[PDB]
Amino acid sequence: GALEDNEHLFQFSCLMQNKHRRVLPIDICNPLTKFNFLECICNCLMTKQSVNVNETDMCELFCPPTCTPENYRRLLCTSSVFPFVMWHDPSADTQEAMLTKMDQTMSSGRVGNSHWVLVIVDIEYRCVTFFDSLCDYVASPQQMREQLEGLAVSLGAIYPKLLSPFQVRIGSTVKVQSPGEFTCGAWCCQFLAWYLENPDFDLEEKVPTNPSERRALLADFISTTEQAMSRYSSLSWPTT
């Protein structure tokens, strides 16, 4: 499927930036997994905070290799929504295995037991939102809430205004991907698009119960979003 590969998720995050002008495109040269996502979310928001007080050096340090430092600073300056996608495969119990299996699936296409989930950090609402199209593929939802609540303390202090923690929302209130579908990527994009449209949406209201109707929603989302992404420069960062 088109939206299951990291590059096409990058291109989707570029598109949300060109549509909404407040989204930080994600950095696929720094793959996240359950091993390193919390740390990287933290580094990103500290970089954002430093840009706020005219400190450009930590920024040059964390700049994505395919993006110019000044352009990265500018995008951080205007972003209030930070999407992060975590890749996961329950076979791997090291980061080097996790990343080796990730490179394999992206190079060959074969999905296997791989899966994407979504974290959105929103500094306009001081909220962290989690979305898993299967609900508990990586961990139990309370285990994920716990991890995330701890990140929210970190973020409240990293990004003031005083240092109170961010709110944590679990957005995947119910399962949206049935068992034999390889659609998590697309579901993460569609959740993000709905979030940008209105950050107070309920997923249960968007998604039909009937399995054909649900599949049809996403299929329409995929075609239309694939069409908007065709006419692009390949893997270039947007400008401000």
Strand pairing partners for 169? 129
CA angle 19, 21, 23 (to 5 degrees): 100
Distance between CA atoms of 185 and 200, rounded to whole angstroms? 22
Q: Which helix (H) or strand (E) segment is 225 a member of?
A: helix 211-230
Burial class (CB in 10 A: 0-12, 13-18, 19+), 20: middle
Q: Is 93 a catalytic residue?
A: no
- Whether the Cβ atoms of residue 214 and residue 208 lie closer than 8 Å to each other: yes
Q: Considering Cα of 119, then 30, then 26, then 127, what sign does the dihedral take? A: positive
Q: Is 44 a catalytic residue?
A: no
Which CB contacts under 8 angstroms, 24+ apart, belong to 191-199?
A: 191/118, 191/131, 191/133, 192/12, 192/13, 192/16, 192/83, 192/118, 192/120, 193/16, 193/221, 193/225, 195/81, 195/120, 195/129, 195/171, 196/16, 196/19, 196/20, 196/23, 196/81, 199/122, 199/125, 199/127
| 66-105 exposure pattern, b = at least 16 Cβ within 10 A, e = fewer | ebeeebbbebbeebebbbbbbbbbeebeeeeebbebbeeb
Which CB contacts under 8 angstroms, 24+ apart, belong to 152-155?
A: 152/128, 154/42, 155/41, 155/42, 155/45, 155/121, 155/128
DSSP letter (8 states) at residue 38: H
Distance, first Cα to last Cα, the chain: 31
Distance between CA atoms of 75 and 70, rounded to whole angstroms? 9
* Among 14, 27, 115, 189, the one annotated catalytic: 115
Distance between CA atoms of 12 and 30, rounded to whole angstroms? 17
> Residues before each break in the chain (C–N > 2.5 Å)?
161
Distance between CA atoms of 168 and 145, rounded to whole angstroms? 7
Distance between CA atoms of 222 and 5, rounded to whole angstroms? 13
- Whether the Cβ atoms of residue 119 and residue 37 lie closer than 8 Å to each other: yes
C-beta neighbour count of 109 within 10 angstroms: 10
Q: Is 42 a catalytic residue?
A: no
Q: Considering Cα of 63, then 66, then 70, then 74, what sign does the dihedral take? A: negative
Resolution at which this structure was determined, Å: 2.3
Q: Which helix (H) or strand (E) segment is 144 a member of?
A: helix 141-158
C-beta neighbour count of 194 within 10 angstroms: 18
Rg, Å, the chain Cα set: 17
* Among 8, 27, 63, 132, the one annotated catalytic: 132
Distance between CA atoms of 22 and 154, rounded to whole angstroms? 22
Amino acid at 106: M
C-beta neighbour count of 183 within 10 angstroms: 23
* Among 135, 184, 188, 189, the one annotated catalytic: 184
